[PDB]
Design an enzyme around this catalytic site. Structure first.
Site, PDB file in Angstrom:
ATOM      1  N   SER A   1       0.806  -1.213   0.000  1.00 26.13           N
ATOM      2  CA  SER A   1       0.000   0.000   0.000  1.00 26.13           C
ATOM      3  C   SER A   1       0.836   1.257   0.000  1.00 26.13           C
ATOM      4  O   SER A   1       0.288   2.353   0.025  1.00 26.13           O
ATOM      5  CB  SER A   1      -0.969   0.011   1.193  1.00 26.13           C
ATOM      6  OG  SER A   1      -0.255  -0.037   2.423  1.00 26.13           O
TER       7      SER A   1
ATOM      8  N   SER B   1       0.309  -3.490  10.997  1.00 26.64           N
ATOM      9  CA  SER B   1      -0.602  -3.311  12.150  1.00 26.64           C
ATOM     10  C   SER B   1      -2.071  -3.614  11.798  1.00 26.64           C
ATOM     11  O   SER B   1      -2.948  -2.763  11.841  1.00 26.64           O
ATOM     12  CB  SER B   1      -0.435  -1.945  12.807  1.00 26.64           C
ATOM     13  OG  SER B   1      -0.523  -0.876  11.922  1.00 26.64           O
TER      14      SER B   1
END
Lengths: 143, 140
Positions: free
Chosen positions: A15, A85
């Site tokens: 990303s 995360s």
């Protein structure tokens, strides 16, 4: 001595978290700001060499990473943390560690068991160039 | 410009006092010094660790890496260590050497006595004089 702040980038691999974090670092160093990309993968070779890759060990790695970020921010740095995360609780714990330390914490979601952040400070999407995205983080810090 | 680590060892021997006064005097000179306290790290970063023999070793191993990280970021790292054993100090030293960070061992005399420290701080010395001796080492 002055205290820094943390920008925590969460999102799936691929990303652009590390790319964006590195370009923000470069742009901040040009500004004369002591920016620092804190990458858990690097810490795994030294500080965190006791951890493996179980879910529990990944949570622990992130818990540790949040304390290293507050420590570097206490030392004056603008800390940029590219970390997948994937669980909200990962990010919530990091936020709480920063609140307890009195260190400002900005969550940047690089969008594409990943639990999507409901309230990031900034949501980045792949339409935009990495240079534009870096400037959006910079604008966030300067706002 | 890479920083360095000063590692203070000894028994009330004035370790945490000399570390703090050096930090203050360096900060006044515009030097980015930082006192890295292992007990404080235990409340946050190292809160997973207990107090067993293995845990105390791990705590020191981690502290040594935090010091090298901070020195790599340009800080003068001052460590009032609880490192009574020689092998402890040796591990910390090796971590710094592996990272290419200069490491200074300061013995606050008053546990395995350092045989070859960069500096021995004697208890007859007023703590202004002790800190100045550390600063002189760093500035030479």
């Amino acid at each position: 001595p002055p205290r820094g702040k943390t920008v925590w980038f969460t999102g799936l691999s691929g990303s652009g978290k590390s790319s964006v974090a590195m370009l923000v670092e470069r742009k901040l160093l040009e500004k004369g700001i002591s920016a620092y990309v804190l990458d858990g993968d690097n810490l795994r070779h030294g500080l965190n060499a006791d951890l493996g890759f179980s879910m529990a060990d990944r949570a622990e790695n992130l818990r540790r990473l949040s304390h290293v970020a507050t420590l570097l921010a206490d030392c004056g740095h603008l800390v940029l943390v590219p970390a997948i995360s994937p669980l909200a609780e990962h990010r919530a714990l990091a936020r709480k560690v920063h609140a307890d330390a009195g260190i400002d914490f900005f969550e940047v979601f690089c969008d594409t068991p990943y639990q999507r952040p409901k309230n990031p400070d900034l949501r980045l999407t792949p339409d935009r160039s990495i240079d534009e995205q870096a400037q959006e983080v910079i604008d966030l810090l300067e706002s």
